[PDB]
Target: S-adenosylmethionine synthase
Amino acid sequence: SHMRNIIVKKLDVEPIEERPTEIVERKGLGHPDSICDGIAESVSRALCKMYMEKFGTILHHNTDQVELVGGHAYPKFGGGVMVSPIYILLSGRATMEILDKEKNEVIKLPVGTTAVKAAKEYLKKVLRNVDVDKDVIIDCRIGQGSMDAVDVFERQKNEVPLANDTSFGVGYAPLSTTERLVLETERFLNSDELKNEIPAVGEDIKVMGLREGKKITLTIAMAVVDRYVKNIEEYKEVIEKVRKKVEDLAKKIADGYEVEIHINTADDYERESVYLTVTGTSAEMGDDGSVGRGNRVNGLITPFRPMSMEAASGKNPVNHVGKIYNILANLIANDIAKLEGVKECYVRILSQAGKPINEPKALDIEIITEDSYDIKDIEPKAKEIANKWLDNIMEVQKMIVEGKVTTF
Amino acid sequence: RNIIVKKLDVEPIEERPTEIVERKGLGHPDSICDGIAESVSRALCKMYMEKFGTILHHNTDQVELVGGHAYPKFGGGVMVSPIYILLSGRATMEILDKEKNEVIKLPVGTTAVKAAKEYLKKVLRNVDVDKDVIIDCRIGQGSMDAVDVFERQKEVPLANDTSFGVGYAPLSTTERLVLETERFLNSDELKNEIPAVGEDIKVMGLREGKKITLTIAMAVVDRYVKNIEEYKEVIEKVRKKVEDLAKKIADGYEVEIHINTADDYERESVYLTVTGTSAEMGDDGSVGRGNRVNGLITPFRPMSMEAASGKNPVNHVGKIYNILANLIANDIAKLEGVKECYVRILSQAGKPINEPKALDIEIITEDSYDIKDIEPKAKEIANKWLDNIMEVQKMIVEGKVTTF
Ligand SMILES: COc1cc(C[S@@+](CC[C@@H](N)C(=O)O)C[C@H]2O[C@@H](n3cnc4c(N)ncnc43)[C@H](O)[C@@H]2O)c([N+](=O)[O-])cc1OC
Ligand SMILES: [Mg+2]
Ligand SMILES: [Mg+2]
Ligand SMILES: [Mg+2]
Model:
């Protein structure tokens, strides 16, 4: 068969849980930076579908550039005022026109309209209390490039792309208790099920987890929607209702740790200086956002784990090696961590320029073994998983386009 | 104070088999955005100080660069579509005179737009700011809640948010090579000698064992190269200079230097620019996409995702703690017995900036040294810095530290 550049090594260090400290952050769906990542990736997905429908392949584009300018608002118990809309600028580049010299024809594609529509539909989905007709302006300066039909023909072969570069991706698994608690706290508080029970909870949620030994302090920033709280008393009730939900979640998935929960810690209840919003996001006035300043593709910010600085959101899922490798590294690590005997796993991938993207210069697998396991019994299974995913790298591309994996 | 010191027993970065490090130089679009953002904050600080004797709330850590278009040509090309730059962020836009019962507007927008143009003029020798660039401004008023926290103790300020900064020391050989290569090639002395060198220089260092491969993407300014031959001569002249640098600071390593590797001499298709930045080529930028405050991008080191550039130097811990962690790590690495030091600092929103929720220190010890002998010394350093935390603000305002 085929031999790739895969390295497996035993990593003989303390695993993450046994280290004394951990810090983990997540910017939730309605956080201005996360809004920008989500729009960036939504626009790419929409363009991919546009290209697939017309040509049966995906053409060059990158929409990993989105700027969110905070609006103007005046929150008030019982329902505040949205004064000036949130301004969002879409940027990047996308293939717009195909020049066919053989036929005497030009094909033009709906790049700008597709982008603006995709952005608006994304905001509609995730921001329950934002009226996208009146509360948002979506502007577009996405570059519109041209391309020869003959190069479209080549792309329609849908062969495995060549790496154009020496690029790097890194991932790991499993998530620690603290990581899982931070991730699932945000996910739960932004789930439809919680919203329906406590509509006052906005989507701009930020969760910080500090572990000291076996004590996890969770600090939650949570935008409250002011039409659902008539006074400071009802605001407090919302905080305490959430505090209890999060307590129950901590019992469910971090049993055995001491968990301490703090919510909206900059509040001053008595002065009524609290985290009230009209729309459920501080994008309405308090804060601004842009792409690549938040969660990594695993959904977390983790200064005790290796992190890539590349912004995956909005990059071409068909040719951008960095995006594909950071996602792939995460997927491979996740499967290797499910193997019997693996306590902890790191996967690093480095491309070989001029070579197919599933023929990397190096793919390094670091494994912390459980007690009484031999790295050499695990290695064959681990290499098989890595080779499985590399064989199916085009499947990964498809998963990105269909939104089956996360970019933030 | 919540200071925590731990021994860290892992392989030191220099001894690991592989290292990858990157620096986005001054004229790279992402770095243009970081530097503009910080320029705007510095100018607003000065304006607020002039009018009120104090810095008012702002955070202009938002700048979006939309690439323009150009037509490079040997001996000098021309710009075709202007680079569009949007200044954004929060700022104190107005003051309420409760006596007159009138709103008074502050010159935020004029100050911001001028600061941005002056910064661009500083870093891009060959840009024409009247023709090649559009600078727009949509900075807006921040929420009153954040303004109150800002004012409550702006003696020792309260932390604006719950965030963390990170820093480490010392730099590895590969990190220093990458950092100093960019700094040298964008030094005034070098560009005076080789004016064909544009400021958009991206340097990536890949170490494998004792081999360091340096990949450089360097914009060449087309008014200073009359033909393809002169272009080649610039490449080889820069190459020689970097070789000499690598002999100085990477002694004992095999260093390969690769410059502008996508060049196609057969088709005369090379990295030529009119302005010295890829921003003219449709490439985009925004803030916090690039270097950390130590000037580097390092996936083999801890990083904070906070973007220091443009954040206010009074109470934004995303700026202050990233600088502070670097200062602390640097001093601890000086200690005999410390091989590597990692510092992570976490705030709690509303608490004084010199009362972090956690100030976390990890130390890889030199062989045979006891962390027990080191711990007290490390703690003292961290406490000394927390005692002197207003020096951070002062160093930042005086322009004595970098934010990227
Ligand atoms: C942590 O405290 C507070 C923290 C913040 C920080 S937000 C950004 C700071 C910056 N854009 C600024 O100009 O102030 C950044 C993020 O913090 C969250 N946030 C916004 N308002 C908040 C609030 N009232 N309380 C807690 N978190 C909030 C939200 O997720 C935002 O994206 C604010 N604030 O700027 O109005 C204001 C607070 O209030 C003192
Ligand atoms: Mg942000
Ligand atoms: Mg970039
Ligand atoms: Mg931050």
Observations:
- The longest strand of chain A covers residues 86-100.
- Residues B 30, 289 surround magnesium ion (ligand 3) (CB under 6 Å).
